[PDB]
Amino acid sequence: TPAFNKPKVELHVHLDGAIKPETILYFGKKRGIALPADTVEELRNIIGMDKPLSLPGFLAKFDYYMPVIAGCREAIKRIAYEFVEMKAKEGVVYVEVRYSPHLLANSKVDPMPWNQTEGDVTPDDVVDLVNQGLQEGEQAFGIKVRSILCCMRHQPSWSLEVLELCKKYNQKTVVAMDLAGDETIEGSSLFPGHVEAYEGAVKNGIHRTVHAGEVGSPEVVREAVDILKTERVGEGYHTIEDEALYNRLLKENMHFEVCPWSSYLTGAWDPKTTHAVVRFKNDKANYSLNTDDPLIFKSTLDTDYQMTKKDMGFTEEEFKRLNINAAKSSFLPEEEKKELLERLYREYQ
Ligand SMILES: OC[C@H]1O[C@@H](n2c[nH+]c3cncnc32)[C@H](O)[C@@H]1O
Ligand SMILES: [Zn+2]
């Protein structure tokens, strides 16, 4: 009994955070790379988390499996492909998947991620591989999928390249640029590489989303919006702590990419306090309900819907409304955007 058994739109999910334990297991064995377990079940209990940790502590879960995927062409395309499939089954009609092309490369990247031996999978090659998998997947499960390339807070040296990859693969799945990573890295929002990359995104008409305010303060959100010119705020829960800023974002109709389950599991949200999404729903704000990293949170899109339904009083009417807003707030070109809205309204009848 799903919380909302109707078409959905997801704008916030990490491809490298939405991998099948069976695929991880498969490639570790296949490449002879170690994993903290050799059973999907125990693989899930190590990578997985059922209790709040922290953002820095949550991010380390990737260390367990990224090494078996990164640098492997077969694996990069496969996870991209199986991702669409996972989305198709969850009832998602349109989705934007994000990831760092750099963290999956083993050539032309410095610092080499995961202590990898050089190879031929360049960062560009990664975008191409994911595009291919995503495309083959759309085709096969019939849902529309786009992608978003992440700048990493800790590695601004990579940012300007990410912008280039967005320019090159514009709408050839790549519809936007994100800034992900450890939001606690003081000043990461302001590092030159990042700033210069967004400045060029603005100048070259490349869409922009920025993770901010999940654990950072209103100023991190203020900087994303004002300095980085972000078009959407990834999560942004802490924005409501600055009534003035909140109201100005509410006025611009800023889209907040919300991830309920994720906010609890990363300790971003104090379970004793009311979720910022309650305030969002109440203020009729522009916001989507997203999954973020389902492999690590051991969840599905329904997990976040059941959470809001059961615990936050969300109705089918709010569910329909938030998704219509997610559609309007997507980085799809006008025509495809209209086509998306058309489908949702058709099905919401
Ligand atoms: O998917 C791109 C990267 O964004 C980061 N990311 C994933 N889930 C996240 C939640 N919050 C902040 N950053 C996240 C991860 O380091 C992942 O490797
Ligand atoms: Zn995220």
Q: Could you characterize what this model shows?
A:
The protein is an alpha/beta fold and 349 residues long. The chain has one domain: Alpha-Beta Barrel (TIM Barrel), CATH 3.20.20. Helix content is 49%, strand content 14%. The protein has an eight-stranded parallel sheet with strand order 1-2-3-4-5-6-7-8. Helix 8 (192-203) links the parallel strand 4 and strand 5 (207-212). The longest helix is centred in the middle third of the chain and has 19 residues, at 123-141. The protein is globular and about 50 Å long. Bound molecules: purine riboside and zinc ion. Purine riboside binds at residues 14, 16-17, 55, 59, 62, 98-100, 103, 150, 180-181, 211, 292-293. The record marks 235 as: Important for catalytic activity.
Overall number of strands:
8
**What number of structural domains do the residues give?**
1
Q: Report the C-alpha radius of gyration, rounded.
A: 19 Å
CATH architecture: Alpha-Beta Barrel
- Helix/strand-derived class? alpha/beta
What multimeric state do the chains show?
Answer: monomer
Q: Compounds present?
A: purine riboside, zinc ion
Relative strand content: 5-15%
The CATH top-level class label: Alpha Beta
- The count of helical stretches stands at 16
